[PDB]
Design a protein around this nucleic acid. Structure first.
Ligand SMILES: [Zn+2]
Ligand SMILES: [Zn+2]
Lengths: 122, 121
RNA sequence: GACGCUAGCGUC
RNA sequence: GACGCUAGCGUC
């Protein structure tokens, strides 16, 4: 399905983002656009920051719900931007039209409309 | 479908053929024939366990001394002491072409899976 | 053996 | 984050 879909925290089922705001960096990593998502996660300086490829691993990000704090991914410095990078294993994908939920472990198995990251959008 | 060879993934020594492979409970895989018994050695299992219709009695390893790659287990099934192998320990070679394939789980290997028959040899 | 989990470890 | 490896752990 290329239809729009929701991402919920796999632990607490809180809404995180929608597939329409997802951008793909280097056909491998996934980020979310908009400020509404920044409220849904909290970050902490990474216990072991690293530089790889085109990223600066600076922080870990977690579900903002203090009762949850589920690991969602990392926060990196990419080019001139500081953006979050998420892993799908921390989320449940819900089809908006039908409500069907899907548990992915790797992004290669989630087939949705993947918009390439565009710097001009930010 | 076509017959294929299984080589030890570490030392590439031939172990068996898909014709001699039988399936137990559509989940476990054993090898028929006496040629295969020359290809593995056994060692009593560190954590013996009974599960389903199996008594986990030993681990099995490649008989080549410079290899001894872990190949699976050896179990007591019904009235038989038979080996049970895991595909991750082997590389599958096609007979006609020599194309090699590395499988990690049996569910991804598609061939004519003949069910184990206690009457069959 | 099938499968599940955790934990580190390494790579760009 | 993506991938790889290891090591145990749990289930029949
Ligand atoms: Zn949550
Ligand atoms: Zn060997």
């Amino acid at each position: 399905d290329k239809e729009n879909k929701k991402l919920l925290c796999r632990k607490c089922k809180a809404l995180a983002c929608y597939t329409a705001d997802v951008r793909v960096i280097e056909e491998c990593h996934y980020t979310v656009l908009g400020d509404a998502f920044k409220e849904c996660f909290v970050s902490r300086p990474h216990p072991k920051p690293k530089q790889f490829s085109s990223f600066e691993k600076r922080a870990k990000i977690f579900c903002a719900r203090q009762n949850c704090s589920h690991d969602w991914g990392i926060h990196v410095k990419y080019k001139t931007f500081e953006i979050p990078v998420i892993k799908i294993e921390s989320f449940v994908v819900e089809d908006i039209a039908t409500g069907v939920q899907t548990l992915y472990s790797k992004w290669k198995d989630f087939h949705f409309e993947k918009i390439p990251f565009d710097p001009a959008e930010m």
